[PDB]
């Protein structure tokens, strides 16, 4: 068996959702921000936001909504986790003591159902009569909000429309009514139903179906003065309400897909709209009052306000202040002005909240020679792309290098006092036949520049027609100085060539240190790339020289230096190249038993291969024979996102389901079959998507640092910006910390009453297993935050083992010391 420990070094920073309301008091204006597993509660001021409370939940926050049922003084909070843990929460404050109350809770998972393409949707009736949930295709789940439903019991209503895009409860209806866009073979349509709690079924809806734009994305329930709904698409915005129909199709929005919406005026007069290019619009409802005394919708107008970060959620607060919640870049507070500035913009940034964004890649480097180590991450996407340099100093200090294009891979080259960074920028097919970039960025702002002139694929004869307005990616290798972080050089790769892998190393007997890049020729027609390059660059005297190029028949997904040789994975193949005295790559040996060799790692003559669907394989280079040997494979199938070697026997993997697992050689030489089977001894639901594992630590090492019980250090970066740490334990230390977890879980009160053991259980759509071989260090480190009565309750009847004394009782002061040392690894 294997024993490991996992802690958070940086909590998730990306904003997954945000709502406003009156949650902490019926009087205050609240802003609740949801980061993965984290809920942040703020109070709105005239200066900005006053933080008041933050809680963690044992689940990914999928739904977050505020509502106030009749009889309540203030808003209540509904949250549903991605594992279908539902709960209703209340804020309660007694002087200085703030706590969160679980009013109702339960798990709403169905035994039989197909998870929907557009994900979990949760909405609440305007009269707060019921909670609507769209969890599975063809089913609509209703949790009625009666006071007796403390277990959140619910029923399903058969829904004929299997493929639903979005749904909202409508305002101004005699009965609870849902309006939703759905897709069938005839296109997309908008349709309404009435929801009857008494009959527990749908009844005919207030207005008929209308056919809508093929890419109708979002539904807006317009408030009582207007009523009805607005439908946002790629090209058009339409309003629907019985006999009334409007459509505005301004050319302004066709340029970029609109992803978020918010209501500015409670009466529905004004809405905010944001798009993937960071543009912020105002949607205006022009009123016309008739002599009847009725109010109708006369027309719709869209007005461009300015530019924000690419926002997952918008929420207007008060006055001119808007909170911009960003998942791909830094979040913001911005002020909307009535008068535009001299550039024509109505938007001026107030504050910027650090978001480590998607961490696509990262490396640890001793820039200042401190023996400490700093973490340089490839963070963000598109305009929010950045390099973030992170050091420990009690908070983490983070420096941001704006790139305005997507960073893909990073690798440090000490000889050149610089970093190599792969990046891609979006250009659009223009009337010249070529393409034009939407904005300047790192690859166009380099001091010196170069473009590949390779003739390898120049023969072509394969047609790829271009239509004006289509997007394409342009990939580059950036040379970036380690002190100024100034782009010294940008090399642009071939048209339709993607840069997938990057290493900096010396090869063979060649004393020169090279940047080596593996690429793939990506054409829309192809399912899997069938052409690619391995390119050897030398950065010398401010310019990048092409030293050699090797053509391959696939995508070079991963490369890693192997004892003076170059180890590269091309599609299914894993290949080892030698670097000749003629400065060309020469193939030594191949291994082909893969589906897609996405990831590679090396220790000694051993290789860890990560596959798209076949989990991880352990290869070995046989120098006596000049070839590879298969040592052991993990035959449990998993979809890999990243891998890492912990030691000669233990191997770490990350799943696309937000799970971690550890494989080990079965170390039983009885049969060859036992050795060739990698046994999954560690299983752990992380809750984050791991892109990059990286050996190293951020802690200061003066070497006077006490030797911690934990041995080894692997950092990992995630899509939501979370940075974590994996380290190993002895059997003695694992048992102590595991037994302590079971005690802590009985003592600590969970938000939503979610069982901790459930949360960390390995989870795919198909299976659920109890966690094994992993200590939730974030749980262990919470021992220091529980009250003294609880601490002593935890240590009761707790014994140590395999120590200086075989049996030794623990005190609350003893464990406080142990955990405090465990907090010093990050």
């Amino acid at each position: 068996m294997s024993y490991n420990y996992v802690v958070t070094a940086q909590k998730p920073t990306a904003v997954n959702g945000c709502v406003t309301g009156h949650f902490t008091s019926a009087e205050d204006l609240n802003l609740l921000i949801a980061k993965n597993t984290r809920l942040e509660i703020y109070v709105v001021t005239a200066e900005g936001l006053r933080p008041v409370k933050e809680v963690g939940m044992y689940g990914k926050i999928a739904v977050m909504e505020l509502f106030r049922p009749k009889g309540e003084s203030k808003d209540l909070l509904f949250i549903l986790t991605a594992k279908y843990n539902a709960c209703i929460l209340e804020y309660k404050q007694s002087g200085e003591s703030i706590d969160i109350i679980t009013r109702a809770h339960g798990n709403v998972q169905d035994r039989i159902g197909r998870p929907s393409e557009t994900g979990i949707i949760g909405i609440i009736d305007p009269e707060c009569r019921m909670i609507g949930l769209r969890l599975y295709d063809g089913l609509f789940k209703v949790i009625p909000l009666d006071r007796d439903n403390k277990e959140l019991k619910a029923f399903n209503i058969r829904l004929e429309e299997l493929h639903v895009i979005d749904v909202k409860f409508l305002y101004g209806c005699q009965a609870p009514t849902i309006c939703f866009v759905y897709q069938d073979p005839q296109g997309r349509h908008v349709k309404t139903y009435e929801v009857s709690l008494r009959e527990k079924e749908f009844n005919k809806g207030p207005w008929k179906q209308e056919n809508v734009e093929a890419e109708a994305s979002m539904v807006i329930a317009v408030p009582e003065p207007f009523g009805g709904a607005i439908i946002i698409g790629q090209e058009s915005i339409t309003y629907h309400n019985g006999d009334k129909y409007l459509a505005i199709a301004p050319p302004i929005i066709k340029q970029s897909t609109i992803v978020c919406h918010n209501r500015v005026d409670p009466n529905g007069s004004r809405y905010l709209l944001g798009d993937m290019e960071g543009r912020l619009f105002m949607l205006l409802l022009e009123k016309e009052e008739q002599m009847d005394g009725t109010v109708t919708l006369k027309d719709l107008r869209v007005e461009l306000l300015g530019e924000t970060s690419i926002a997952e959620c918008l929420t207007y607060l008060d006055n001119g202040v808007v909170f911009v919640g960003s998942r791909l870049g830094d979040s913001q507070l911005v002020k909307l002005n009535v008068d535009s500035n001299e550039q024509g913009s109505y938007v001026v940034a107030m504050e910027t909240f650090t978001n480590l964004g998607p961490i696509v890649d990262m490396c640890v480097v001793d820039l200042e020679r401190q023996g400490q180590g700093q973490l340089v991450t490839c963070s963000g996407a598109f305009k929010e792309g950045s390099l973030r340099i992170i050091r420990n100093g009690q908070k983490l200090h983070i420096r941001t290098v704006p790139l305005y294009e997507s960073p893909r891979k990073i690798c440090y080259q000490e000889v050149s006092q610089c970093f190599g960074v792969l990046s891609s920028r979006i250009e659009v097919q223009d009337t010249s036949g070529g393409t034009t970039a939407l904005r300047p960025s790192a690859s166009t702002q380099a001091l010196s520049s170069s473009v590949s002139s390779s003739k390898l694929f120049s023969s072509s004869t394969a047609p790829h027609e271009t239509s004006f307005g289509e997007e394409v990616e342009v990939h580059n290798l950036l040379i970036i100085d380690q002190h100024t972080f100034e782009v010294l050089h940008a090399h642009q790769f071939l048209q339709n060539e993607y840069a997938l892998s990057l290493v900096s190393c010396k090869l063979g007997k060649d004393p020169n240190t090279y940047f080596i890049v593996g690429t793939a020729m990506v054409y829309p027609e192809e399912a899997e790339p069938k052409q690619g390059r391995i390119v050897v660059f030398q950065y010398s005297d401010g310019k990048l020289q092409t030293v050699a190029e090797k053509e391959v028949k696939g995508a070079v997904y991963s490369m890693v230096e192997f004892n003076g040789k170059l180890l590269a994975s091309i599609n299914s193949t894993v290949r080892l190249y030698e670097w000749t005295t003629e400065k060309e790559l020469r193939t030594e040996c191949n291994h082909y038993n893969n589906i897609m060799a996405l990831y590679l790692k090396t220790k000694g003559d051993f290789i860890l291969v990560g596959d798209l669907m076949r989990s991880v394989l352990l290869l070995a280079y046989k120098p006596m024979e000049g070839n590879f040997e298969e040592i052991a494979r993990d035959f449990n199938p998993n979809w890999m996102s990243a891998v890492e070697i912990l030691d000669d026997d233990n191997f770490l993997g990350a799943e696309n389901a937000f799970n971690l697992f550890v494989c080990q050689k079965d170390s039983a030489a009885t049969t060859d079959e036992e050795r060739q089977h990698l046994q999954e001894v560690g299983l752990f639901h992380l809750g984050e998507f791991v892109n990059v594992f990286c050996h190293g630590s951020l802690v200061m090492q003066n070497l006077g640092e006490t030797s911690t019980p934990t041995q080894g250090s692997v950092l990992f970066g995630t899509v939501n910006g979370m940075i974590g740490l994996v380290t190993s334990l002895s059997e003695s230390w694992y048992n102590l910390l595991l037994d302590m977890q079971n005690r802590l879980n009985k003592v600590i009160k969970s938000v939503g009453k979610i069982e901790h053991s459930f949360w960390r259980s390995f989870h795919t759509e198909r299976k659920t297993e109890p966690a094994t071989g992993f200590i939730d260090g974030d749980l262990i480190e919470s021992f220091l935050d529980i009250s003294r009565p609880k601490m002593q309750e935890v240590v009761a009847n707790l014994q140590y083992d395999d120590g200086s004394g075989m049996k030794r009782e623990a005190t609350a002061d003893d464990l406080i010391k142990v955990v405090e040392e465990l907090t010093r690894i990050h």
């Binding site: 998607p358 996407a381 790339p529 997904y557 897609m596 696309n656 759509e765």
Partner: protein
């Protein structure tokens, strides 16, 4: 000649790697040195010498040289390790069963989460599986181990049934005592949970119905670790075993012993309301408690869902590709 099996050496294949761990040996991917064809080699280890050549392999050699069907895996030949020269007693070299290499297995594709099935994809998949099963059943052979892992799939959309290690002949006229515990619990029929021991080819049909539902849900339908727990889950959806729906249930050994918590009513049509009507009717008939009322393989092929499916159009599933490695930023 092509028929003189057991003599050709495994030297004739370049071994690529081990695709899986089997029952009587490890399964290896390999390339034929002469033709270039990719094969899968099932290694047979007789070195144990407990009972010699494993019967599981004998069944697969005996049966798969009889069965010829596009939806039934074909054994190409049997090859051997370099045999010790004229000293058969010391010779402990193994034998390898040569099969056509198939790109994927359904379990691998489903477990990885890298396959999406449309209705038309499910039609092409089910029609091939039922045709393969009908061929086998028409030849009076039982598979007895139908699982997603035993359904191999090429990217073209061709399906083939594979593990015939537990397959045996069925005699209608004469009931024969068989092995009660044959199919894996998740795909095991209710009759065998109660221990019929004299089972019909309908056991294989129930398994294929479980697959039909799993293709629509992407999650296995009846997942339990204990035989009684399985009966409960099946009972909740298909209804509790009772004499009205299964007149002969009272003779089954464990009927009184193994009882569900309640006498649940059948809810299959309600819980699978999202499944198309043509398919839902097939599921109701395939997942019928009474094996004598459970539909046949032929009857599934003469169903509204599958009868008009044309195998010229195989409809490949939406399978693993290159952008599946990259995660979408928006």
């Amino acid at each position: 000649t092509e028929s003189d099996w057991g003599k050709r050496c495994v030297d004739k294949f370049d071994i690529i790697g081990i695709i899986g761990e089997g029952t009587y040996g490890q399964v290896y991917k390999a390339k034929d040195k002469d033709t270039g064809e990719l094969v899968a080699l099932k290694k047979v280890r007789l070195d144990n010498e407990k009972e010699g050549f494993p019967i599981t392999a004998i069944r697969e050699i005996k049966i798969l040289r009889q069965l010829i069907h596009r939806s039934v895996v074909n054994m190409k030949e049997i090859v051997t390790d370099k045999q010790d020269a004229l000293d058969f007693k010391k010779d402990k070299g193994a034998f390898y069963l040569v099969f056509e290499y198939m790109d994927h297995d359904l379990m691998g594709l489903l477990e990885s989460g890298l396959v999406h099935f449309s209705e038309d994809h499910i039609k092409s998949f089910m029609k091939q599986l039922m045709e393969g099963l009908e061929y086998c059943h028409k030849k009076n052979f039982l598979h007895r181990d139908i699982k997603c892992s035993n359904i191999l799939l090429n990217n073209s959309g061709q399906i083939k049934l594979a593990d015939f290690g537990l397959a045996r002949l069925y005699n209608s006229e004469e009931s024969r005592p068989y092995t009660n515990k044959v199919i894996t619990l998740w795909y095991r029929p209710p009759e065998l949970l109660l221990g019929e021991e004299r089972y019909t080819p309908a056991i294989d049909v129930w398994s294929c119905g479980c697959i039909l539902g799993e293709l629509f849900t992407k999650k296995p339908i009846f997942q339990a670790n204990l035989e009684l727990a399985q009966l409960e889950l099946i009972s909740r959806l298909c209804g509790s075993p009772c004499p009205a729906v299964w007149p002969d249930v009272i003779r089954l050994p464990y009927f009184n012993t193994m009882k569900p918590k309640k006498q649940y009513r059948r809810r299959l049509r309600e819980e699978f309301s999202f499944i198309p009507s043509a398919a839902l009717d097939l599921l109701d008939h395939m997942l019928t408690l009474d094996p004598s009322k459970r539909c046949t393989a032929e009857q599934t092929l003469q169903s509204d869902f599958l009868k008009d499916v044309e195998l010229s159009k195989m409809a490949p599933p939406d399978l693993p590709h290159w952008q599946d490695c990259h995660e979408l930023w928006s």
